[PDB]
Design a binder for this molecule. Structure first.
Ligand SMILES: Cc1cc2nc3c(=O)[nH]c(=O)nc-3n(C[C@H](O)[C@H](O)[C@H](O)COP(=O)(O)OP(=O)(O)OC[C@H]3O[C@@H](n4cnc5c(N)ncnc54)[C@H](O)[C@@H]3O)c2cc1C
Ligand SMILES: Cc1cc2nc3c(=O)[nH]c(=O)nc-3n(C[C@H](O)[C@H](O)[C@H](O)COP(=O)(O)OP(=O)(O)OC[C@H]3O[C@@H](n4cnc5c(N)ncnc54)[C@H](O)[C@@H]3O)c2cc1C
Ligand SMILES: N[C@@H](CCC(=O)N[C@@H](CS)C(=O)NCC(=O)NCCCCNCCCNC(=O)CNC(=O)[C@H](CS)NC(=O)CC[C@H](N)C(=O)O)C(=O)O
Ligand SMILES: N[C@@H](CCC(=O)N[C@@H](CS)C(=O)NCC(=O)NCCCCNCCCNC(=O)CNC(=O)[C@H](CS)NC(=O)CC[C@H](N)C(=O)O)C(=O)O
Lengths: 486, 483
């Protein structure tokens, strides 16, 4: 009918590409997708493929895999492997080179995708709303920039994702974000990662494996302990294991200002009065939805706390305008953005409405060692349930008894609704935790009870079999009070 | 005098003896031929898994896996003088002996500190349905060290390697000796397509000297019979790619020790090859003879003791669990049967072991994880079967250099209702991934339960949540595809 496109997707990331693909393919709709760059890298960092591909999950997993070899090389000795350890060295530029080729290939893959799909078209530029049914494509983020294209459409989808949050403190311009970290030419000998979240924790491990001769990695966090939002036992254990591998963790510390010393070094003064020197300061304190450049007021789309407000079906307060992924500020993860996009396309161009359950979402932290988690943490469950039970198990994995890494304790924790045995959450710390948690993610979707876990025969020998060996709770939570059996 | 007498202090035996004395306060006597691992009897207090099974082989597979990491590290910028690389078989053996020895001790410690639990060193045999004798040897004419009268007897003698009757079999070893070799063989021949043969081939392949070679031969057409055909084909390609030599439809006829101390092996086809070590891993059989079972009249069916779903034999007060029953020879299963037996005998609730949908792994390089039925079976028990396949080179293997390491995930379902009949995996961490899905099958999950779960990204396991369209089906045993 009138309006050239059926759907206009602003942002070619995880959710955008999924949305765009389904509508053109499954429903035969003419879709236009817009993004700022064709390939990864400065100046805009993300490009076709989104954050996960260009400056997220893909590159960090390869870099984390590389860091892990430091562990492998050191531990091989416990099993009789010999070599002249004095010739060992990590070549950072090689890592960056292979990472760049891996991402570039994905960028190309998405490009040919458009070239081979009828009804799917890509537009290079910055998209913004002129009105609720007209999207402009400009040369730059500036709203007074030249208009390259003007797309009339029947439906609009906002999938601009997020961007790192730089705190307004003196000297912030001497700091970088995770964005620049992917393109460093050399690894910093002295680096400070500001933040207690997963990005900060993951990069600290990367920097720890590739740091030069007299290097030191320092992580600092404002609060009491790292990984706020995760199970307290795992937060405590990971802190010990990271420290044991040479990472200095400064909690209860908060920068006041960053000064650039004449020798190119940065001096950081904390509110405590403590002053330290680093070669690189990286801010990984949070990510914010990118709503700014969209010009949402031209359509009257409502923004709640930072992100675009949407209902359960990803619909905004304005008809024919939807938003998915990180810009909605729900659960900032790739698999969730993809699930929302596919559900949204079904609700809009399909027969049956559909929505994404944002509960019992399994996720991981690729720290060294890594974390896997699904469900509620006891602190939250105990406030929602009158009777909660906590099953805990800590042991040294077989290989680490002889590998030398005595400190690598594997922690398994299952929390349940004691009134009926329903498993509310599973939290793991230890090697392969991210691979083990996927399968249990399905179990919670099936509303499994603790009895269901221990009535399954285990695979011997593996770390995973321990989840099927927890029959008795360690302590309980009765109306928020911690209690035990005498 | 004792409430229960357990013949065999292994995975199942110790499990029964423990909670019977604990949970039911019964006086238990446990018998075993050796207290520490190694020659002469190899197995000892703790059983096969602990002494010459799961525990020691797992440490050795971890050791062999480092050949992969050392090589693959180069792809991520790790460099070192690769010409100075050498593997030390004796350090590997030294550390595993330590680890095993500490576990043997841990069990001895257990008996002293547990009231009503007593260990008797030696060989146990039935004198009568209520009398058990502990002699100094497997030969029933040896000195009776102890005589015990009990109202309950539990048989858990386990299994033992099956050495074929061929000329020269005295120049061959079994998996038992493998754990104690002083130096790694230059040329080794592993006979058998089973898991023990495949796992050891990967261990020998990693610790082989300078100009070494590992050969695996199997009578059949393809290794790992009983496993999913795709995994069998794919694993073969990957073992071969790593330098392992696989000879299918070959079987040794005779083994002649020759001059220099090597062995000349002549296969049934006429092929003749020399090896420095020949390991026979063709089978495991229940140890029932030394029990003098006819002294009580307990039935034997096919090598193993005949028992019902509740592990009771034909004689009222005698039960049998574990490998000796020839059901499913795995440690977790034996442990489950033990606890269920103890309940059915000293408890209010009769309880039995579900031998179906048990997950298991093969610690080969790369490993295998599996749970449920294979399509060859499912299409015979079901009229409409759907097969979902996913093959892909993981992210890290694109960059590590090991581009041949293809990850395979296969899901088999009963297409009439979507119920998942089996999940088979090949690839790094397959053993860890399969455990969680093992629970899913006990909960009777359907394929929709898998693809409706949000994945963990990036991981190999999320691929199981992205399979939603069948590759092909099986209609009344016939393979069919949608047009
Ligand atoms: C360092 C890091 C590590 C991460 N690791 C993980 C992990 O391992 N697992 C996981 O699940 N998630 C991880 N994430 C998060 C994951 O990347 C995001 O949740 C996911 O990318 C969100 O998908 P999306 O569709 O919302 O947005 P995106 O993929 O971010 O796509 C948004 C797109 O919008 C484009 N754009 C922005 N504004 C405009 C405009 N006005 N006009 C045109 N184009 C525009 C951007 O260039 C970008 O390509 C990580 C994130 C970071 C940064
Ligand atoms: C090389 C190898 C690798 C394996 N790997 C795995 C694996 O990774 N995972 C897995 O689940 N399973 C594995 N298994 C199988 C597993 O070890 C057995 O299934 C398990 O040990 C069986 O427990 P059980 O109690 O039935 O026997 P056992 O552990 O075999 O205990 C039997 C005990 O009886 C004793 N004995 C025998 N006869 C007498 C007698 N008359 N008097 C006194 N003592 C006697 C023996 O000395 C032995 O200690 C492996 C086995 C082998 C050989
Ligand atoms: N929940 C996702 C899981 C896989 C995933 O994250 N896929 C991303 C790719 S990064 C994706 O497809 N996002 C949306 C999208 O692109 N939709 C359009 C449909 C076509 C899909 N892509 C076509 C182009 C082909 N290349 C890629 O998609 C490149 N992707 C990858 O390389 C991703 C990393 S983001 N692989 C995986 O995450 C696989 C896991 C890996 N094998 C491991 O072992 O770790 C899903 O269900 O698809
Ligand atoms: N989960 C499987 C069974 C796993 C298993 O084989 N467990 C063995 C432990 S060796 C066992 O307990 N067998 C029976 C038994 O021992 N019964 C007697 C009563 C309880 C006390 N037994 C333990 C004595 C102390 N020493 C050890 O337990 C030393 N064990 C280990 O080191 C074992 C290997 S057999 N680790 C595990 O079994 C756990 C896995 C390992 N941590 C990993 O990293 O993968 C199942 O039942 O489904």
């Amino acid at each position: 009918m009138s309006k050239i496109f059926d759907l206009v997707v602003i942002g070619a990331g995880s959710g955008g590409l999924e949305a765009a693909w389904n509508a053109a393919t499954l429903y035969k709709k003419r879709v236009a997708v817009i993004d700022v760059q064709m390939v990864h890298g400065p100046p805009f960092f993300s490009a076709l493929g989104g954050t996960c591909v260009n400056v997220g999950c893909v590159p960090k997993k390869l870099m984390v895999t590389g860091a892990q070899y430091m562990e492998h090389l050191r531990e091989s000795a416990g099993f009789g492997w010999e070599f002249d350890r004095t010739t060992l060295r990590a070549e950072w530029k090689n890592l960056i080179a292979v990472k760049d080729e891996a991402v570039l290939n994905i960028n190309k893959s998405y490009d040919e995708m458009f070239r081979d799909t009828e009804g799917l078209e890509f537009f290079l530029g910055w998209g913004s709303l002129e009105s609720k049914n007209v999207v402009n494509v400009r040369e730059s983020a500036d709203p007074a920039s030249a208009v390259k294209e003007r797309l009339e459409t029947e439906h609009i989808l906002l999938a601009s994702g997020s961007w790192p949050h730089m705190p307004n403190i003196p000297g912030i311009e001497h700091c970088i974000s995770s964005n620049e970290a992917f393109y460093l030419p050399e690894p910093p000998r002295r680096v400070l990662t500001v933040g207690g979240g997963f990005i900060s924790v993951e990069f600290a491990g990367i920097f720890n494996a590739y740091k030069p001769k007299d290097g030191q990695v320092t992580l600092c966090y404002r609060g009491e302990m790292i990984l706020r939002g995760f199970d307290h036992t795992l937060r405590e254990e990971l802190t010990k294991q990271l420290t044991a591998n040479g990472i200095q963790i400064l909690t209860k510390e908060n920068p006041a200002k960053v000064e650039l010393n004449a020798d190119g070094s940065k001096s950081v003064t904390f509110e405590s009065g403590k002053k330290m020197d680093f070669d690189l300061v990286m801010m990984a304190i949070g990510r914010s939805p990118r709503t700014k450049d969209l010009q949402l007021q031209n359509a009257g789309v409502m923004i709640k706390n930072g992100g675009v407000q949407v209902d359960e079906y990803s619909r905004t307060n304005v008809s024919n305008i939807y938003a998915i992924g990180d810009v909605t500020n729900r659960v900032m993860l790739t698999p969730v953005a993809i699930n929302e996009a596919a559900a949204l396309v079904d609700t809009v161009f399909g027969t049956t409405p559909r929505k994404t359950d944002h509960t019992r979402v399994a996720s991981a932290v690729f720290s060294i060692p890594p974390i896997g988690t699904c469900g509620l943490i006891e602190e939250v469950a105990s406030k929602r349930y009158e009777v909660v039970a906590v099953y805990l198990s800590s042991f040294t994995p077989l290989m680490h008894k002889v590998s030398g890494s005595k400190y690598k304790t594997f922690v398994a924790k299952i929390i349940t609704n004691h009134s009926d045995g329903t498993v509310l959450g599973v939290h793991l710390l230890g090697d392969n935790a991210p691979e083990i948690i996927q399968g249990i993610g399905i179990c919670l979707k099936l509303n499994a009870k603790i009895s269901d876990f221990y009535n399954t025969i285990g695979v011997h020998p593996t770390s995973a079999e321990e989840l099927c060996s927890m029959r008795t709770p360690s302590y309980y939570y009765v109306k928020g009070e911690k209690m035990e059996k005498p």
